[PDB]
Write a protein that binds this ligand. Structure first.
Ligand code: BCL
Ligand SMILES: CC[C@H]1c2cc3[nH]c4c(c3C)C(=O)[C@H](C(=O)OC)c4c3nc(cc4[nH]c(cc(n2)[C@@H]1C)c(C(C)=O)c4C)[C@@H](C)[C@@H]3CCC(=O)OC/C=C(/C)CCC[C@H](C)CCC[C@H](C)CCCC(C)C
Ligand SMILES: CC[C@H]1c2cc3[nH]c4c(c3C)C(=O)[C@H](C(=O)OC)c4c3nc(cc4[nH]c(cc(n2)[C@@H]1C)c(C(C)=O)c4C)[C@@H](C)[C@@H]3CCC(=O)OC/C=C(\C)CCC[C@H](C)CCC[C@H](C)CCCC(C)C
Ligand SMILES: CC[C@H]1c2cc3[nH]c4c(c3C)C(=O)[C@H](C(=O)OC)c4c3nc(cc4[nH]c(cc(n2)[C@@H]1C)c(C(C)=O)c4C)[C@@H](C)[C@@H]3CCC(=O)OC/C=C(\C)CCC[C@H](C)CCC[C@H](C)CCCC(C)C
Ligand SMILES: CCCCCCCC/C=C\CCCCCCCC(=O)O[C@H](COC(=O)CCCCCCCCCCCCCCCCC)COP(=O)(O)OC[C@@H](O)CO
Ligand SMILES: CCCCCCCC/C=C\CCCCCCCC(=O)O[C@H](COC(=O)CCCCCCCCCCCCCCCCC)COP(=O)(O)OC[C@@H](O)CO
Ligand SMILES: CCCCCCCC/C=C\CCCCCCCC(=O)O[C@H](COC(=O)CCCCCCCCCCCCCCCCC)COP(=O)(O)OC[C@@H](O)CO
Ligand SMILES: COC(C)(C)C(=O)C/C=C(\C)CC/C=C(\C)CC/C=C(\C)CCCC/C(C)=C/CCC(C)CC/C=C(\C)CCC=C(C)C
Ligand SMILES: COC(C)(C)C(=O)C/C=C(\C)CC/C=C(\C)CC/C=C(\C)CCCC/C(C)=C/CCC(C)CC/C=C(\C)CCC=C(C)C
Ligand SMILES: COC(C)(C)C(=O)C/C=C(\C)CC/C=C(\C)CC/C=C(\C)CCCC/C(C)=C/CCC(C)CC/C=C(\C)CCC=C(C)C
Ligand SMILES: COC(C)(C)C(=O)C/C=C(\C)CC/C=C(\C)CC/C=C(\C)CCCC/C(C)=C/CCC(C)CC/C=C(\C)CCC=C(C)C
Ligand SMILES: COC(C)(C)C(=O)C/C=C(\C)CC/C=C(\C)CC/C=C(\C)CCCC/C(C)=C\CCC(C)CC/C=C(\C)CCC=C(C)C
Ligand SMILES: [Fe+3]
Lengths: 44, 325, 255, 51, 51, 273, 76, 51, 44, 51, 44, 51, 51
């Protein structure tokens, strides 16, 4: 089982879950902002 | 404050060193006789001499003295053999290259013939001093780094005086032998071909010259700060790492995020210094032969700035208002 | 003169060729300077996950003089210290360490020395390079003020002993060390001071780095006629550590 | 004007009618014999110092 | 994919998070500045015009 | 990540101000009080430069130009678009440079070394403050400083030299150019000598200082030594930067005419017939 | 005796300042008088640091050293 | 989203707090100057004009 | 349990609680300031 | 909000007070100078003009 | 077996499969974007 | 081919991954900027023309 | 031709692979840029003239 960082498989799964959860909220906020911007000044 | 190590506190003197030897027998051609200077010894070594005399050095010295005397005697004769006027106008006189009408043929002695004879003696002198620098490493069983670094500057020397005039088709493209007259040549060369600021290889040469001076301030200062740990004995630090090298590396690592080694900093220094005349010569060789106006070249290649405001003093003030009337 | 295509002429070709050459030269120069101190480690002595963008160089060999052998780099760290009295002040990386006992006696911080070879450095003839002046044929003080016989004053204003001799480098004709005989009140025997840490005046010789009470713990040479590289490193580091550890006010912020 | 530039100006320019311009008006031109050189540029520089 | 979580067996999170934060802030600043260099999308000038 | 020998040097103490509030490392970089002030000033300056570039209308690195104000504003403050951004960026740059020097001082104090490097950097700071603060104050307007542009700060140099007709004839510029060329010749020689001593032909042993001293006395009859060469290099570099500052501060506030005319004192000395 | 050398160089600096002011009273300009002042300093101060500081103290010591140099020669 | 506190198992608060303290004050100063460099939103000039 | 800083599970929750409480006092003040500025000089 | 005292469990007050004092004085000086750099809010010019 | 990095055959196979999955996903997103852009403003 | 995975028996994954991450972003930025320098594909100017 | 595989008994594959990748990308970029400098093969300009 290859590992350069010293982490285990279970630790990596636990970290990735929270990372993805925090990455989805940022995308949702960006999507809402882009929709508001398109409604004020369309670009397409 | 603490001692700073710029001047030696106390000097000691012993028997004069005559140098190392090997099977090549360097002693046979070394002069006997040495001196000591206590004024210099406040900064560096006090011993003066001895020197090695081979054939390359003797030929270089003789042919360089000949060049100097052809120029000096021509300068003296231009003034009517008047010594006080010769002294008065020393910085202004020169031995002028030939006129453009003669091409690459041999000009009259009054109009560049002595300039060509003297240029042939300076050429011979310089190439002989380089063969001496190569032979001495070979005889000392060392590397040839000094000779290569000297050839780097000889490249720009030859480009300025030999190669570019031949490719341009006139001996009139060479540099005059004078103090002020040679500086007038620099300004006129820059003006004639647009603006030499906009030659990219001139900019690269300036980059490497600035970098070489920044590196001796950094290297000299760094070595003087670790001399309390024996840091000026660099070769033994290379062969056996000590705390001086470690502290010197860690200072720059903590300062700017990367560092060098005791041996590897000298490669950095060697390359920055060597790269200045190479890029300079490449830049000079491209002028007139390829590019005739460097500012128009910059406009063509889109790195020439543009200005919006107007030109003229009366766009900003009044002649009466500048005098206080 | 003509162009090859668009605005591309001989000057552009030369410029791009120089760009490529300079990129290769930067790679070579950065790789050449990685023969000491690698691979990288973390604050617990283990190999670090990150090793940077440049790979390590191949090996070079140096043939040493006087039958000392060969040196191959990059290789193992032979100058590594074994048991350092240091303590972590944090659980992760990036924070300083604290000495466990006396920092000056344990050789840590600005008092750290590197484990060099336990032999003196030689000159061209195979002889020790640094020799006391009382055994150096033909040498004398030719300029400046002679410090032999003057008293030595410490950083707190105490007289600790007298200068007895000077140790010189005969090949380069330079003074390297001053030899001090201690008064019985401040210790016993003889000690050395490197020349770059003293100020020689007309009536005294000043050493500001350490105090009087620190003069008995200066490391001592084994032989009275020669000094090895390891002893040199331990003596110089001891004096260097006093600039920070002599007084508690030298370590705290000066504000 | 306190320099070593030619003292021939004001006689070839303000008494006779010689060309003062030296610049090439293209980035790359084919240089011919008889075109201005840096020697002419120094005479123009002397005249401009006089100005 | 289901195995993307193994990326943390190769890269250390401490460095990755710092690099990603720097990259994201720089990208946001670049875009916000690019919008202000035009005329149709410069809101400071639009607010002055509809004054 | 640390080098193989770095851990024993990373101790606490040796700060001018801040104590252990900023006594740590980020990656290889050391931060202290002056590491926080450097970051703030440098980031503010760069962000303002790019905002000015956006308002100018071009993002091309060759063509970005932020310029000082007109001479009519004197020593007062101009509107931020007509030259005030230049003033703010100048203040930020001065702060960043001084913080960099004071950070180097703390690193030197922690490592137990001498303070030669910050002292050497102070000379370059002095040449820059002469160009943007001292000459402009003496001449009476901030508009005498050079602009912040890669190719537009060369136009300033060109126009400032032809404003004295033939700049090569400036006496203190001649001294400064000589110092620059001599530093480069000496750096080349030093690097070549050390490398040639450490890298002999294949099959040979390495050389020592005796061999280096001998080669140079054979070549030119003198050798400065292994300690003298560093002193001489430092002194040459510092003399080069000091004389550069002098050449610019006399060109404006001390001399008004062409520089060739300054030589008249030599040409009309009463001894000459 | 490096302290007598520095004194002698300072008397040269002082003579140079006096040479400038004297030529200016007689009709020369500053820079003309200051070139002459610099040469007075360098020639005279140098000459005095060789001659005066080279008459080093020794008294019967001087004598014997010289009478013994006069014995080196004679068999050289 | 409820497991965000684990960020403090990765980063020590001492470094993060000083980084955030520098970042926030830098942002504020910049927006005030970008605002001060316009015609519509410079509040020092508005008080002079409205007077 | 993965811990690069050495904190336990409960210590991290305590620190997070207090941090997020200062993020809301800073956000509320910013929101009020932006509302006042928009009423004074609109930009949308 | 009632547990903000714990900031003194992370940062040493001795080294925080000095930095806060320096920051406060520099900010006050900058604001006073910025006011002095204008026309409407320069109180030295106003007294001369009014009287 | 030849190995310059230190991994085994199984570790290399496992790494390559996960690499290829992300490469295909990235390519699919790029393909969708390119088709939409071609519909909006055709080249060729 | 079915034996391409052996590329990971020659190259270190970390150095390759970092290099590819830098390369892809630089290439994408270059293409997005090349499109913005034309007349037919600059969407910012197209939006203003159709507004 | 059967014995070309012995080229790997001379050259180290780790160096050759990196050099080949850099060379291939640079050559492809140069060709693509050379095509855009002509008029008959510039597809961005061709698209504008067909609309
Ligand atoms: C109006 C003036 C023009 C200008 C016109 C030129 C011209 C023309 C040239 C330079 C060149 C150079 N310019 Mg420029 N330059 C200008 C403005 C500047 C500015 C500035 C404004 O700050 C700077 C920093 C520089 C700097 C430089 C250098 C980077 C470069 C010289 C390289 C070198 O190796 O020199 C060091 C010099 C040498 C190596 C000469 C070789 C010496 C030989 C080897 C000596 C042999 C031995 C000898 C004969 C024996 C003597 C006797 C002994 C005692 C025995 N320029 C302006 C734009 N510049 C040169 C270059 O390369 O251009 C690209 C060049 O030709
Ligand atoms: C870029 C570096 C330059 C350089 C430097 C240089 N050369 C030097 C020195 C220095 C600093 C000396 O001090 C030394 C010397 O003694 O010169 C008179 C010397 C020297 N360089 C020489 C050669 C030489 N250098 C060359 C090059 C160069 N050397 C460059 C110009 C070249 C050429 C053409 O490239 C040549 C041919 C000789 C002139 C000389 C060789 C030294 C020698 O033969 O000494 C013999 C010993 C003596 C007894 C003479 C010393 C004079 C006094 C009677 C001794 C007492 C000392 C007194 C107290 C002070 C006077 C000494 C002054 C130099 C300060
Ligand atoms: C990499 C580029 C840099 C560089 C490097 C460089 N220069 C070098 C070298 C190197 C590596 C040498 O090895 C070589 C050398 O010998 O250095 C000590 C040299 C050298 N570079 C020199 C000059 C020089 N280099 C310059 C530039 C540079 N060189 C760059 C900054 C410059 C300029 C214009 O900036 C100059 C003026 C020489 C000192 C020397 C070349 C020596 C040579 O070829 O001499 C020929 C000799 C004669 C002319 C015959 C002698 C006739 C003399 C007129 C009189 C008698 C000699 C006497 C000793 C001088 C007078 C003094 C009196 C008191 C006696
Ligand atoms: C004898 C003086 C020589 C010298 C010395 C010197 N400089 C030094 C040192 C020393 C000894 C260092 O220790 C130090 C260092 O760390 O070097 C790695 C340094 C240094 N000198 C440097 C560069 C430099 N030195 C130069 C020259 C010289 N420095 C002289 C030749 C030059 C030039 C023009 O020739 C440059 C460009 C830096 C690489 C470095 C450290 C400076 C530094 O990092 O300061 C902190 C600031 C920042 C990281 C960014 C500041 C951002 C600003 C707020 C905005 C930018 C505004 C700017 C004015 C715009 C200019 C635009 C131009 C296109 C005109
Ligand atoms: C475009 C990008 C830059 C942004 C644009 C603005 C700035 C431009 C100016 C200068 C750029 C210098 C940036 C250097 C910053 C380095 C940061 C750092 O620290 O990076 C290191 C990696 O770097 C290094 O190892 C040193 C890199 C070279 C240093 C600069 C050379 C300047 C040479 C010549 C002068 C340059 C003039 C041009 C000549 C044009 C020529 C045509 C990470 O750490 P490391 O541990 O060392 O990793 C390595 C190893 O160990 C693996 O293990
Ligand atoms: C604080 C405020 C900042 C001030 C704001 C002003 C903006 C400009 C100032 C600085 C810009 C430099 C920023 C970069 C510094 C990154 C920090 C750093 O280096 O962080 C390291 C992480 O490495 C890296 O991030 C690697 C960086 C690669 C450098 C590129 C090499 C060539 C580059 C250049 C060649 C130049 C040629 C010509 C150029 C034209 C052509 C380029 C931690 O290292 P570590 O954990 O110890 O170990 C790991 C170690 O080995 C390597 O990974
Ligand atoms: C024309 C010049 C353009 C400007 C200059 C940038 C290009 C110059 C070259 C390099 C810049 C530094 C980027 C590379 C180094 C960063 C450090 C790094 O890779 O960190 C990694 C995390 O990253 C990755 O995993 C790779 C992804 C990088 C993506 C960012 C690209 C930055 C691209 C550009 C800059 C910012 C854009 C955002 C603003 C918009 C423009 C204004 C941590 O893993 P690790 O511990 O290091 O891995 C161990 C390993 O070392 C074992 O050997
Ligand atoms: C128009 O043309 C130009 C050039 C001008 C452009 O604008 C071009 C622009 C581009 C080419 C832009 C390209 C942009 C990207 C590729 C952007 C990519 C951005 C991301 C992938 C962002 C990802 C962000 C993810 C985040 C923030 C996720 C999570 C964060 C956290 C979860 C924090 C909390 C973490 C914890 C608690 C982990 C701890 C867990 C334990 C188990 C201990
Ligand atoms: C116009 O466009 C331009 C380019 C000009 C822009 O302006 C662009 C601008 C941006 C792109 C801006 C982007 C801005 C952000 C991303 C901003 C982000 C801001 C935050 C995340 C702010 C966070 C603030 C958090 C705060 C203040 C938290 C806490 C404060 C406390 C006092 C908490 C106290 C904690 C204690 C006591 C812990 C003690 C506990 C123990 C257990 C000991
Ligand atoms: C038009 O002319 C000009 C010059 C302007 C051009 O634009 C010319 C342009 C070119 C010539 C462009 C050429 C471009 C290329 C050749 C591009 C090639 C790009 C790729 C091959 C990209 C590949 C990307 C692959 C990726 C992202 C794959 C996977 C990533 C991941 C899977 C991440 C997750 C990884 C994990 C978890 C590792 C698993 C770990 C274990 C331990 C099992
Ligand atoms: C018009 O004129 C100008 C100047 C503009 C030109 O354009 C002139 C142009 C030229 C003169 C161009 C010349 C071009 C060439 C000579 C090009 C040559 C190209 C090649 C030889 C390309 C080779 C490509 C090979 C590839 C892509 C190989 C890939 C291999 C693999 C992916 C497999 C990897 C190997 C593994 C895994 C080994 C297995 C490992 C084990 C451990 C068993
Ligand atoms: C009369 O009084 C005495 C006797 C004391 C004197 O002798 C006094 C002497 C003087 C006062 C002399 C003064 C000398 C000068 C002021 C000299 C100045 C010299 C220069 C600045 C020279 C620069 C030379 C060269 C330059 C800048 C570049 C390149 C040149 C060359 C490569 C020259 C080489 C020439 C060649 C190869 C052409 C040869 C021709 C052939 C056909 C082979
Ligand atoms: Fe060195």
């Amino acid at each position: 089982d290859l590992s350069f960082t010293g982490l285990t498989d279970e630790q990596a799964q636990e970290l990735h879950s929270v990372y993805m959860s925090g990455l989805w909220l940022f995308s949702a906020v960006a999507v809402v902002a882009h929709l508001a911007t398109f409604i004020w000044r369309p670009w397409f | 404050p603490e001692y700073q190590n710029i001047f030696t506190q106390v000097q000691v003197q012993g028997p004069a060193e005559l140098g190392v030897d090997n099977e090549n027998n360097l002693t046979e051609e070394r002069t006997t006789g040495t001196g000591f200077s206590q004024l210099i010894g406040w900064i560096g070594n006090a011993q003066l001499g001895p020197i090695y005399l081979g054939w390359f050095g003797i030929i270089s010295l003789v042919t360089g003295t000949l060049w100097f005397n052809i120029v000096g005697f021509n300068m003296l004769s231009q003034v009517g053999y008047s010594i006080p006027e010769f002294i008065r106008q020393l910085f202004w006189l020169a031995l002028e290259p030939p006129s453009p009408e003669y091409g690459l043929r041999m000009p009259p002695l009054d109009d560049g013939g002595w300039f060509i004879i003297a240029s042939f003696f300076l050429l011979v002198s310089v190439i002989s001093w380089w063969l001496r620098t190569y032979q001495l490493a070979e005889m000392h069983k060392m590397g040839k780094h000094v000779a290569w670094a000297f050839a780097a500057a000889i490249w720009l020397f030859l480009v300025l005086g030999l190669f570019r005039p031949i490719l341009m088709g006139s001996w009139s493209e060479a540099v005059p032998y004078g103090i002020f007259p040679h500086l007038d040549w620099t300004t006129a060369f820059s003006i004639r071909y647009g603006n030499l600021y906009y030659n990219p290889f001139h900019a690269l040469s300036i980059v490497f010259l600035y970098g070489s001076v920044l590196l001796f301030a950094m290297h000299g200062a760094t070595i003087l700060a670790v001399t309390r740990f024996g840091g000026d004995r660099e070769l033994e630090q290379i062969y056996d790492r000590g705390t001086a090298s470690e502290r010197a590396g860690l200072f720059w690592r903590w300062t700017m995020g990367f560092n060098a080694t005791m041996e590897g900093i000298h490669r950095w220094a060697w390359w920055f210094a060597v790269l200045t005349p190479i890029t300079g010569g490449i830049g000079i060789l491209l002028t007139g032969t390829v590019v005739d106006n460097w500012f128009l070249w910059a406009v063509e290649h889109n790195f020439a700035p543009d200005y919006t405001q107007d030109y003229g003093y009366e766009a900003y003030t009044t002649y009466d208002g500048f005098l206080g009337r | 003169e003509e162009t090859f295509f668009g605005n591309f002429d001989l000057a552009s070709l030369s410029l791009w060729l120089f760009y490529g050459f300079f990129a290769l030269l930067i790679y070579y120069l950065q790789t050449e300077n990685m023969r000491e101190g690698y691979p990288l480690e973390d604050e617990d002595g283990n190999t670090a996950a990150n090793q940077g963008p440049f790979p390590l160089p191949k090996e070079k060999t140096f043939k040493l003089q006087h039958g000392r052998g060969e040196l191959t780099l990059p290789g193992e760290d032979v100058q590594r210290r074994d048991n350092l009295a240091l303590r972590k002040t944090a659980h992760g990386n990036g924070f300083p360490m604290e000495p466990t006992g006396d920092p000056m006696l344990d050789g840590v911080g600005p008092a750290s020395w590197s484990k060099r070879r336990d032999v003196p450095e030689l000159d061209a003839h195979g002889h020790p390079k640094i020799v006391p002046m009382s055994a150096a044929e033909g040498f004398g003080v030719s300029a400046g003020t002679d410090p032999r016989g003057l008293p030595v004053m410490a950083g707190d204003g105490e007289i600790v002993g007298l200068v007895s001799d000077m140790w010189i480098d005969e090949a380069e004709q330079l003074v390297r060390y001053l030899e001090l005989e201690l008064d019985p009140e401040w210790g016993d025997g003889k000690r050395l001071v490197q020349r770059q840490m003293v100020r020689i005046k007309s009536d005294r010789v000043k050493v500001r780095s350490i105090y009087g009470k620190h003069f008995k713990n200066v490391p001592k040479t084994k032989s009275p006629n020669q000094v090895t590289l390891l002893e040199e490193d331990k003596i110089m580091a001891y004096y260097a550590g006093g600039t920070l550890y002599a007084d508690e006010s030298r370590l705290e912020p000066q504000l | 004007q306190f320099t070593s530039l030619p003292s021939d100006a004001l006689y070839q320019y303000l008494l006779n009618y010689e060309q003062i311009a030296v610049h090439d008006l293209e980035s790359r031109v084919e240089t011919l014999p008889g075109d201005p050189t840096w020697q002419n540029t120094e005479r123009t520089y002397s005249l401009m110092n006089y100005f | 994919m289901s195995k993307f979580y193994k990326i943390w067996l190769i890269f250390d999170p401490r460095r990755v998070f710092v690099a990603q934060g720097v990259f994201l802030f720089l990208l946001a600043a670049m875009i916000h500045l690019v919008l202000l260099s035009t005329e149709h999308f410069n809101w400071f000038e639009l607010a002055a015009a509809n004054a | 990540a640390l080098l193989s020998f770095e851990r024993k040097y990373r101790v606490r103490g040796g700060t001018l101000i801040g104590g252990d509030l900023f006594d740590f490392w980020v990656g290889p970089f050391y931060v202290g009080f002056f590491g926080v002030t450097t970051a703030f000033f440098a980031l503010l300056g760069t962000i303002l430069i790019f905002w000015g570039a956006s308002q100018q209308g071009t993002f091309n690195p060759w063509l970005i130009n932020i310029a000082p104000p007109d001479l009519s504003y004197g020593l007062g403050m101009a509107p931020l678009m007509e030259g005030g951004l230049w003033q703010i960026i100048t203040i930020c740059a001065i702060g960043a440079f001084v913080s960099w020097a004071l950070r180097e001082v703390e690193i030197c104090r922690k490592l137990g070394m001498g303070y030669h490097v910050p002292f050497a950097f102070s000379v370059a700071i002095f040449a820059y403050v002469t160009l943007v603060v001292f000459r402009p104050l003496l001449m009476g307007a901030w508009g005498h400083g050079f602009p912040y542009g890669i190719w537009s700060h060369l136009d300033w140099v060109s126009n400032t030299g032809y404003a004295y007709l033939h700049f090569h004839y400036n006496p203190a510029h001649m001294l400064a150019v000589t110092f620059f060329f001599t530093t480069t010749l000496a750096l080349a020689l030093h690097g070549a000598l050390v490398l040639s001593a450490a890298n002999p032909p294949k099959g040979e042993e390495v050389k020592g200082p005796d061999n280096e001293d001998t080669f140079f006395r054979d070549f030119i009859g003198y050798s400065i030594g292994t300690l003298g060469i560093h002193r001489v290099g430092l002194l040459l570099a510092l003399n080069a930067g000091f004389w550069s500052a002098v050449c610019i501060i006399i060109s404006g506030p001390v001399w008004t005419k062409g520089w060739p005319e300054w030589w008249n004192w030599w040409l009309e000395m009463p001894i000459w017939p | 005796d490096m302290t007598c050398t520095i004194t002698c160089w300072g008397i040269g600096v002082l003579l140079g300042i006096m040479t400038t002011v004297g030529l200016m009273v007689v009709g020369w300009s500053f820079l003309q008088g200051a070139f002459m002042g610099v040469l007075a300093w360098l020639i005279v101060g140098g000459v005095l640091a060789v001659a005066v500081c080279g008459k080093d103290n020794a008294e019967q010591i001087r004598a014997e050293m010289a009478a013994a140099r006069e014995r080196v020669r004679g068999a050289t």
